[PDB]
Amino acid sequence: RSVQWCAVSQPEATKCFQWQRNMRRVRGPPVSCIKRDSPIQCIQAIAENRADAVTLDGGFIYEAGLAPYKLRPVAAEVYGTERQPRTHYYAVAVVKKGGSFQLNELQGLKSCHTGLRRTAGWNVPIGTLRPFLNWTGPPEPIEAAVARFFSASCVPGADKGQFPNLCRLCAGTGENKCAFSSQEPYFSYSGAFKCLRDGAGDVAFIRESTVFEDLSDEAERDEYELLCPDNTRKPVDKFKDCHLARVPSMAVVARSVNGKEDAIWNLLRQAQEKFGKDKSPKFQLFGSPSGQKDLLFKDSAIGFSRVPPRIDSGLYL
Numbered sequence: 001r002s003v004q005w006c007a008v009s010q011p012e013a014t015k016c017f018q019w020q021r022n023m024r025r026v027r028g029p030p031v032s033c034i035k036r037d038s039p040i041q042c043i044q045a046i047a048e049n050r051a052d053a054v055t056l057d058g059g060f061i062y063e064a065g066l067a068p069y070k071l072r073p074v075a076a077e078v079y080g081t082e083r084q085p086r087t088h089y090y091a092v093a094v095v096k097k098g099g100s101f102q103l104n105e106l107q108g109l110k111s112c113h114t115g116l117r118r119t120a121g122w123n124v125p126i127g128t129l130r131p132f133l134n135w136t137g138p139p140e141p142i143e144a145a146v147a148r149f150f151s152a153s154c155v156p157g158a159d160k161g162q163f164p165n166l167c168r169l170c171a172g173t174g175e176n177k178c179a180f181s182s183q184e185p186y187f188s189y190s191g192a193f194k195c196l197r198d199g200a201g202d203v204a205f206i207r208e209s210t211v212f213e214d215l216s217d218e219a220e221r222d223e224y225e226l227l228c229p230d231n232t233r234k235p236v237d238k239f240k241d242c243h244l245a246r247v248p249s250m251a252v253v254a255r256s257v258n259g260k261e262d263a264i265w266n267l268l269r270q271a272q273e274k275f276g277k278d279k280s281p282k283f284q285l286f287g288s289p290s291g292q293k294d295l296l297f298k299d300s301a302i303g304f305s306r307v308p309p310r311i312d313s314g315l316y317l
């Protein structure tokens with residue numbers, strides 16, 4: 001049949017339907033869409049045969065690989081350039097130029113995170129800051145120690161009921177405040193970076209490219225610097241010498257048994273040829289419209305790379 005793609009929002013479904021009409025027009029391999037609400041709803045649906053595929057961040061790749069889902073990664077997103085390509089990215093800590101604090105001096109400060117359980121926005125910074133955390137738990141949750149450490153944060157998807165200070169800086173309206181979706185304006189890489197630019201937080205945990213994709217002016221880019229792990233501040237273009245971790249790309253996952261891996265692969269490979277970076281004026285696979293960013297796949301991606309057979313979700317990570 002078709003490859004069924006899981007979409008986690010309404011604009012993502014809209015792009016999926018456009019991908020399906022574009023593949024038909026061009027007579028490529030068929031794709032069809034499914035609309036879920038979070039990434040776990042798409043992980044549940046693929047597992048229960050209602051969808052076949054979805055692209056995930058490293059922290060959810062972990063989660064989808066567990067029992068009883070047992071999903072595995074099939075294609076990794078390629079970043080960088082055509083000349084210098086890579087299947088990895090970098091977790092950074094961005095701050096405003098002018099400050100004096102370091103990575104070791106973050107106590108009581110205000111933070112912006114891409115979302116809860118995301119790689120560069122959460123797992124990496126909480127894994128790094130662990131010595132200052134003073135986590136006595138469990139049974140105390142990790143979010144409770146983080147809430148005590150930072151004065152206020154914006155961590156989309158965190159429980160505002162139990163941990164009110166982690167959603168305190170979040171900019172969404174009403175029930176969408178602290179939401180793990182595009183309705184919370186500080187969600188993801190650009191939202192976390194915008195929380196830093198707005199002045200609500202003193203540090204944003206993101207990836208290396210967000211500042212270059214969001215600030216096109218180079219002079220505007222000189223108002224920010226990175227917080228390195230040697231406790232030094234360095235400019236934004238020195239990410240390879242100033243990062244918290246080198247993390248593998250976001251990946252498309254499928255089922256480990258009867259997952260349609262080769263069908264998924266041929267779809268992606270064909271979609272990258274016809275609708276890739278500068279391939280078509282009609283449809284852009286690595287592109288989002290207007291008030292949207294990273295719909296289905298990351299906007300700055302330039303391709304896919306087939307993840308080898310018998311590679312685990314834990315062994316890919």
Ligand SMILES: [Fe+3]
Nearest residue numbers: 057058119120
């Ligand atoms: Fe990520």
